[PDB]
Amino acid sequence: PRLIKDRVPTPERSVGERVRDFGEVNLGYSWELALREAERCLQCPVEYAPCIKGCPVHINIPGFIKALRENRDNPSKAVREALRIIWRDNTLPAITGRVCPQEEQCEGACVVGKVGDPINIGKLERFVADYAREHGIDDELLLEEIKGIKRNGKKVAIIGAGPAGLTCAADLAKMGYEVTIYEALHQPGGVLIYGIPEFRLPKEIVKKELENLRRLGVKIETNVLVGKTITFEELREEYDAIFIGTGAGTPRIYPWPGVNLNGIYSANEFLTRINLMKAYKFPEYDTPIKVGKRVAVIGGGNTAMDAARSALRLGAEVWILYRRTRKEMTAREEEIKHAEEEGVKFMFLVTPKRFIGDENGNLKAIELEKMKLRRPIPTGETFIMEFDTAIIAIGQTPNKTFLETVPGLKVDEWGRIVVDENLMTSIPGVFAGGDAIRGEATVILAMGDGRKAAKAIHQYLSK
Amino acid sequence: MMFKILRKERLAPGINLFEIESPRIAKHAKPGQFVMIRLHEKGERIPLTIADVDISKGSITIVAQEVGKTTRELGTYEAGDYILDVLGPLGKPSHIDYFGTVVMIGGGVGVAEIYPVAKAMKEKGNYVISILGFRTKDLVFWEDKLRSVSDEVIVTTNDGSYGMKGFTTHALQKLIEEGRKIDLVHAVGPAIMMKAVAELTKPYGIKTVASLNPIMVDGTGMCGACRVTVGGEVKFACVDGPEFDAHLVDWDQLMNRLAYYRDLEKISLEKWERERRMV
Ligand SMILES: Cc1cc2nc3c(=O)[nH]c(=O)nc-3n(C[C@H](O)[C@H](O)[C@H](O)COP(=O)(O)OP(=O)(O)OC[C@H]3O[C@@H](n4cnc5c(N)ncnc54)[C@H](O)[C@@H]3O)c2cc1C
Ligand SMILES: Cc1cc2nc3c(=O)[nH]c(=O)nc-3n(C[C@H](O)[C@H](O)[C@H](O)COP(=O)(O)OP(=O)(O)OC[C@H]3O[C@@H](n4cnc5c(N)ncnc54)[C@H](O)[C@@H]3O)c2cc1C
Ligand code: SF4
Ligand code: SF4
Ligand code: FES
Ligand SMILES: [Mg+2]
C-alpha cells in the first residue's frame, strides 16, 4: 500500500499562555482532524496487526479506527461504534489515550512509524472517549450495560481507588456483585487525582468514572485506611472476596546528607499539595506550597516531569537533574518535549552527593557527582550548584506498613504482593493487581489487571 | 458523606473540644493515635490527637488549640456542623507496659493529648505523675480529668498565677533533685517544650518518649512531609511514630521544618480575618 507518512497534528495551547495555569496543554483532535488521521491507517488484519500486539490489553485498534472511517458522515454513530469496540478491552480510554507511553506500546509497533509518523493511536482513542463524553454517547453505552446487570447477592471489597480498583469495581458491578471501594485519601482516583497534574489529565475525566461507578451502584468509602480504620480480618468476615489495589505510593528517598533541609520535597508531597490540595490556588485554597527562585528536580521519569512543569508554573527556574542520559529517561516522550518547550532545563549524568543548607536550615545548594557510562558510575568529579528548592523524583514503592499488617499475605522483597495466574494472593479469595503487584508501572496495566481480577473473582465465587 | 459534630465544649480560651461521630475510628483507636481532618472543600488537612473515645456513642474526641487559620475556623464550628473528612486512627499506638513510675508531661493542648496515655499507663499498674504546663491560670483545663487517671498531679503556670510557678521542666527538675524514682518520661506539647524535657533528662539517663508534631499532609506514609531524623536515620512520623525516643530526635531540625511556612500561614490567617471584618 501507499503510506501517508506525516501525522495530522493535534493543536496545543501556546507556551506563553499555558505556563500561567494548570489547564490541559494538548487540545486533542476535532472530528475532521481525527477522521483524516484515521484515514492514514493501513488496516492491518486483526490477527497480526502489530499495534494490537503492542497495546498491553490488545485493543482492536484497526477495528475502532475502521468504525470511524465507515461512518464519515455520522460522527455520533462513528464514535459510539468505536467506543463500543474500545470498551471491549479498556475501561479508561480518555485516560490511556492521554498518558500511555505509546512510543513503547501501540504506536511504537505501528508499521507507518517505520517510514514516517506512526498512526496517532492514543490521540484517536482519546478523541473517541472525549467526543463520547461531551455528547452523552458513553452514557448511552453504559446504560445499555446497566440494563443487563443481574444481581447475584454477593459482596466484594476493593482496597484502593486508583485505576486498578476503579476498573475492577466497575467490571464486578456489571457482573452483578455488590461492590464497596475503600480509599484512604479524601477523594478517589489514586495517582490519577493526586499525582498526574491537570495540565495533562483534567480532573473531569476521573470524575466521569466516579459518576459511572455511582450509576453502576458501586459504593465508595473515602477516609478509610484499611489496616487501621477497618482491619483486613473485618473485611474478610464481611465480604465474599477482596481485591487489593493499593498501588506503590511510598517515596524512594536515598540517604543523602541534608535531605531534611527546608525546601526539599518528595515528588509525592509536592504533587499532592499541588494536585489534590490545589496549593497553586493558595490562598483561595488553604494548603500552602513554597518554591524558591531555582528548583532542582532529581530524576527522569513522568513523576520528575510533572514536578518540574508544576514548579515552573509556580514561577521558578527549573532544572531536571538526571543520573543517566537523555535517551534513558523514562518519562513519556511527548511530555519531555512539552517540558523543553515550557523552559525546563536539563542536566544529565549527575546525581546528588549532599544537600547544603544555610543557618536557618534552608536549602542553598546541591553538591553533584558527575557520572559516566550498563549502569552509570561516578567520575570522581563533583561541583556545587545553587538551588532554593529540590524535588526528589527517583521512584515510588509499595507501603510495607500496610502490607505487613495483612495476616497471611505473601509479599516479595520489593513490597510486591505475590499472585498466581488468576491474580490470587496467598489468601484464598483475596486478589491483587496494578502497582501493588508490579511496582510502579502504567495506568493501562493497572486497568488491565483490574479487569482480569474481576473475571478471576467471578470464577472463584461461581465455582 | 461527612463526620457530624456531636458536641462542642470550650475548655479554655482558644482550646476547643469536639466530640465527633465516627464509629469505625472509635472502635479501633488506641492511646497515642491521631486523625487527619479537613473542614471543607477548600481546606487543608491537619493532624489532631484522639484525646478520648466513647464506643457506646461511636464517637471520638479531639481538642484543637486556636493557632492559625484552620484551627481558628474549626473553633467557630458548632454541634450539628460537619467535618468534611476525618481519617483515623493514625500512627502507632503508645507503647504501654509496666515501667514503674511514669511521669506524663503535657504542655498546653498537650494536656488533652496525654490523657488517654496517662489512663492506659495507670490501667497497666504504673505509678503515674502528671505534670501539666500552662502559660497562665485562665488556660488551665482538665486538671480533675488528669487527676482521675494519675497518682499525683503537678500544675504549673509560667507566671505563677496558679499552681507551681515556672515551666513543666521546673517541676520535673524538682522531682529529679528530690531523688524521686522515675522510670519513664512521656512528653507531649510544643516542640520547644519537648526538646527542653529531653535535654533535662538526657544527663540522668531517664528513658524519655516524645510525641512529635511535624507538618503532615496525607498522614499515611505517602510523602515524607512529616519526616524527622531519629538516631541519624530518616523516619516518617505519621507511620513510624509519632512517638520516638526523645534523646535520639534532631530537635533543631524538627523546629526548623515546622517554621517553614510561617509567612504563608500568616497570609492565610490575615485573609480570613480581613474577609470577616464587616458585620
Ligand atoms: C507522578 C506520576 C506520573 C505518572 N504518569 C504516568 C503516565 O503518564 N502514564 C502512565 O501510564 N503511568 C503513569 N504513572 C504510573 C501510574 O499512575 C500507575 O501505574 C497507576 O496509577 C497504578 O494504579 P493503581 O490503582 O494500581 O495504584 P494507585 O493508583 O496508587 O492506587 C492506590 C490508591 O488506593 C489508595 N490506597 C492505597 N493503600 C491503601 C490502604 N492501605 N487502604 C486504603 N486505601 C489505600 C490510595 O488512596 C491510592 O490512591 C505515573 C505515576 C506517578 C506517581
Ligand atoms: C501527630 C500530631 C498530632 C497533633 N495533635 C494536636 C492536638 O491534639 N491538638 C492541637 O491543638 N494540635 C495538634 N497538633 C498540631 C496541629 O496539627 C497544628 O497546630 C495545626 O496544623 C495548625 O494549623 P493552623 O492552620 O490552625 O495554623 P497554621 O498557621 O497552619 O500553623 C501554625 C503552627 O502549626 C504548625 N503546623 C502548620 N501546619 C501543620 C500541619 N499540616 N501539620 C502539623 N503541624 C502544622 C506549624 O509548626 C505552625 O507553627 C498535632 C500535630 C501533629 C503532627
Ligand atoms: S491503551 Fe495505551 S496502548 Fe492500548 S491503545 Fe490506547 S494508548 Fe495505545
Ligand atoms: S499498525 Fe499502524 S497501520 Fe497497521 S493497523 Fe495498527 S495502526 Fe493501522
Ligand atoms: S504526612 Fe505524608 S508521609 Fe507522614
Ligand atoms: Mg494551616
Q: Are A14 and A88 within one domain?
A: yes
Q: Are A421 and A386 within one domain?
A: no
At position A288, the amino acid (one-letter code) is: P
Whether the Cβ atoms of residue B221 and residue A227 lie closer than 8 Å to each other: no
Whether the Cβ atoms of residue B187 and residue B197 lie closer than 8 Å to each other: yes
DSSP state of B84: S
Sheet holding A241-244, edge to edge: A219-221, A178-182, A155-159, A241-244, A430-432
Q: Are A18 and A115 within one domain?
A: yes
Strands (E), chain B: 3-12, 15-21, 34-38, 46-49, 52-54, 59-65, 82-83, 85-90, 101-107, 127-134, 152-157, 164-165, 184-188, 208-211, 227-230, 233-236, 243-245
Cell for B73?
A: 475556623
SS3 B31: coil
Final residue of a structural domain among A398, A422, A437:
A398
Paired sense of beta strands B85-90 and A219-221, if any:
unpaired
Distance of CA B103 to the CA centre of its chain: 16
Distance of CA B187 to the CA centre of its chain: 9
Distance of CA A11 to the CA centre of its chain: 22
Cβ-defined contact of B218 to A272 (cutoff 8 Å): yes
Output Rg (C-alpha) for chain B, integer angstroms: 18
Among A183, A223, A274, most B C-beta atoms within 10 A, so best to mutate, is A223
Cα of A354 to nearest chain B Cα, Å:
15
Distance of CA A221 to the CA centre of its chain: 22
Cell for B190?
A: 510544643
Query: Which residues are CB-neighbours of A110 under 8 A, at least 6 positions away?
Result: A50, A51, A54, A118, A119, A121
DSSP assignment of B228-258 equals EEETTEEEEHHHH-SEEEGGGB-HHHHHHHH
Whether the Cβ atoms of residue A241 and residue A158 lie closer than 8 Å to each other: no
Paired sense of beta strands A345-347 and A317-321, if any:
parallel
At position B84, the amino acid (one-letter code) is: L
Q: Are A27 and A133 within one domain?
A: yes
Cell for A306?
A: 510533572
Final residue of a structural domain among A372, A398, A424:
A398
Q: Are A303 and A258 within one domain?
A: yes
Please give the Cα distance from B58 to B22 (Å, whole number). Answer: 6
Q: Are A30 and A139 within one domain?
A: yes
SS3 A105: coil
- Euclidean distance between the first and final Cα of chain A, in Å? 50
- State the distance from the centre of ligand 5 to the C-alpha of B223, rounded, in angstroms: 5
Cβ-defined contact of B87 to A266 (cutoff 8 Å): no
B274: contact with A, CB 8 A cutoff? no
Helices A75-87, A61-69: crossing angle, 10 deg rounding: 170
Please give the Cα distance from A367 to A298 (Å, whole number). Answer: 13
Give how far Cα B156 sits from Cα of A158, A180, B136, Å: 51, 51, 9
Q: Are A285 and A343 within one domain?
A: yes
DSSP assignment of A382-451 equals EEEEE-SEEEE-S-EE--HHHHHHSTT--B-TTSPBP--TTSB-SSTTEEE-THHHHSS--HHHHHHHHH
Cβ contacts of A184 on chain B, cutoff 8 Å: 87, 218, 220
- In this complex, the residue of A225, A262, A401 whose CB is nearest that of residue B87 is A225
Q: Are A90 and A40 within one domain?
A: yes
Strands (E), A26-184: 155-159, 178-182
Q: Which atom of ligand 2 is nearest to the CA of B71?
A: 26
Q: Are A378 and A421 within one domain?
A: no
Map grid coordinates 471520638 to a residue. Answer: B60
Closest CA to A143 of A218, A232, A212: A212
Query: Which residues are CB-neighbours of B5 under 8 A, at least 6 positions away?
Result: B18, B19, B20, B21, B77, B78, B79, B80, B81, B82, B83
Binding site membership of A125 for ligand 3 (Cβ less than 6 Å): yes
Query: Resolution for this model in angstroms, one decimal place?
Result: 1.6
Please state the φ and ψ torsions of residue A385, each to the nearest 5 degrees.
Answer: -125, 130
Q: Are A277 and A371 within one domain?
A: yes
Overall number of domains in chain A: 3
- In this complex, the residue of A251, A284, A362 whose CB is nearest that of residue B224 is A251
Please count the CA atoms within 13 angstroms of the CA of A201 that sit on its side-chain side.
26
Among B21, B69, B220, B271, most A C-beta atoms within 10 A, so best to mutate, is B220
Q: Whose CA is nearest to atom 37 of ligand 1?
A: A246
Please give the Cα distance from B88 to A395 (Å, whole number). Answer: 27
Q: Are A125 and A180 within one domain?
A: no
Q: Are A109 and A214 within one domain?
A: no
Phi-psi region of B219 (alpha: psi -120 to 50; beta: other; left: phi over 0): left
- State the distance from the centre of ligand 4 to the C-alpha of A331, rounded, in angstroms: 24
DSSP state of A272: I
Is A166 exposed, middle or buried (CB count within 10 Å of its CB: 0-12, 13-18, 19+)?
buried
At position B193, the amino acid (one-letter code) is: M
Please count the CA atoms within 13 angstroms of the CA of A160 that sit on its side-chain side.
29
Domain range for residue A170?
A: 144-248+399-463
Closest CA to B104 of B192, B2, B172: B172
Final residue of a structural domain among A143, A166, A197:
A143
Closest CA to A316 of A279, A280, A291, A283: A291
Binding site membership of A91 for ligand 3 (Cβ less than 6 Å): no
